Amino acid sequence: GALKRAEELKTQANDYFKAKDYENAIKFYSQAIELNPSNAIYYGNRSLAYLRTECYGYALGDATRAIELDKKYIKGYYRRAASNMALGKFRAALRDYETVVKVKPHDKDAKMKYQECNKIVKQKAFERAIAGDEHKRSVVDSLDIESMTIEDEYSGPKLEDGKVTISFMKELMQWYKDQKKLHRKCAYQILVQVKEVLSKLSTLVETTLKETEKITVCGDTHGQFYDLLNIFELNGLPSETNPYIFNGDFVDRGSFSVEVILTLFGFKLLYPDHFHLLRGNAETDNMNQIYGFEGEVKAKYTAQMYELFSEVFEWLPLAQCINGKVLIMHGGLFSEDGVTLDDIRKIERNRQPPDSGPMCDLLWSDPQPQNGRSISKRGVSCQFGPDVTKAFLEENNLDYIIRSHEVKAEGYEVAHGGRCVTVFSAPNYCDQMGNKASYIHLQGSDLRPQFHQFTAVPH
């Protein structure tokens, strides 16, 4: 019978297997099973040789069938449990080990392995009993509050569940002229959806800008409703039709400052691909204490709203590049010339360093016409200039930088030959400070800074 030739071939296969010539052995193993279903001890040895050759399935099936037809095949249960362990399956190996151990209690090798694997399983069991999600839960309650619908809708807004219509975003703006507010549930409904979208969106933003599209930029625009009306005089509607970059302090030093971000966040949900809203320094937590916005929100709405706005100020984009040719930035890149947005991106958008430290050194590193790097009196202790900025443009392959933080007695800045560009977009800061504002028109095919002047603001 042919099986006896396969058994002789299995004797040389064990010599060959112990000499790593596995392919010959496995051919002879196939020839043996092609006839014989029942050579249990030598199946378990193809089960072992298969385990060593990572043929998990064959061995597992061979042991299962053998144990099913032979409930006494203890070495097969031991091979099966060893294969299960190697695959990473503990509970199946335990069931097999317990079954080896009850069918033949006299083999201490099976017994010690069973109890070692039980002890290993106690760790994974304890891990499933001790663990939980590694964050404070907090703002997720905003989903619960809305899903509880404490009130649903209001005399002004008509908001949709998500992606509020452009006509309702228009409506919302035109009773910010009337100086009304959103209902708390519907303000939460947009804000949690905005948060979710911002939490998914790229960990730090780099974009190739397209050719025919025309730049609208705001530098700082410390929130005022006339400033919103006046930018709708300065340009048409952002409307997925023009790239619209809000590179500014917006949320501070003006009475209408939560209202500015409430509409602008709406527009970011509806216009995601080329609407980019970058952190001021003044959007950060402590800014709201020093210029009272923390308490101004707390009067306007209960404190949890302000906590959500402070959380969304950590979810907001930190810096970004336009076409790989201009850095759009509140301030300027931190420390030495080698830092890119590809270095900064590795740090996630759920954080703030010290007020003089790496993100804040972005947000507030000041200029100088003085060409070197330097440290500044304002409080960040950092200010950089034309030699260092040209080194960043080469290191990072850019052609110019736009900055937005610096209040002006008039308008914009062109400095050191226009390689660096300043835009400032808050004509009145408060009754301490009224002066001219600048806007820029720039186009995504051809790049040089070109300037628009903005004269006066009412109240």
Binding site: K119, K122, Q123, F126, I130
Partner: peptide
């Protein structure tokens, strides 16, 4: 969970550690 303090917080903690020694496989 009801707002009642223990008579001896240490022996609760000893009993929790008698459990955590299982949890760490110590003894």
């Amino acid at each position: 969970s009801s707002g009642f303090s223990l008579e001896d917080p240490q022996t609760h903690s000893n009993r929790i550690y008698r459990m955590i020694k299982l949890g760490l496989g110590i003894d």
